[PDB]
Paper text:
The specificity of PRDM2 is unknown. Unlike I-SET, Post-SET is absent from the PRDM2 structure, which lacks co-crystallized SAM or SAH. The Post-SET domains of G9a, GLP, SUV39H2, but not PRDM2 include a ZnCys motif previously observed in the structures of Dim-5 and the H3K4 methyltransferase MLL1. (1) A flexible or even disordered state when no co-factor or peptide is bound. Mapping the electrostatic potential along the molecular surface of GLP, G9a, SUV39H2 and PRDM2 shows that the peptide-binding groove is consistently electronegative.
Numbering used by the authors: 1 to 147
Write the structure that this text describes.
Amino acid sequence: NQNTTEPVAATETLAEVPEHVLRGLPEEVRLFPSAVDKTRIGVWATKPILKGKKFGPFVGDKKKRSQVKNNVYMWEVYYPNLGWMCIDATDPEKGNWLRYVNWACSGEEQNLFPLEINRAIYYKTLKPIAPGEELLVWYNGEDNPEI
């Protein structure tokens, strides 16, 4: 979280992405080091993307909250008669290219928001995205005007 002189303990490069994850991207996006955290891989637009474009589904292993160790590579989704489950893509072999979409910092420059369809998370564009801009997800906000 810092451009400083302290040593970095772990780096993720393009060489470490699973081959089947790379083969799965649509034309509009590519994988490339994140500008938000250059020690990890992120997702970038290759061409103009319209507002309202949907990507997904996000996939991952179903686990109880008590078994998941981070809030970065996971979403929570309810399954009737099974309960609230975490969909965990911490291990990239269990997920797809949506795993690599980094999070906006306090929503800054967010251009993707989550929506649930058929008990899976998809990402939808909040605004148009220009070629060479990083895809960044954050939560839904309360958008209504108090005027």
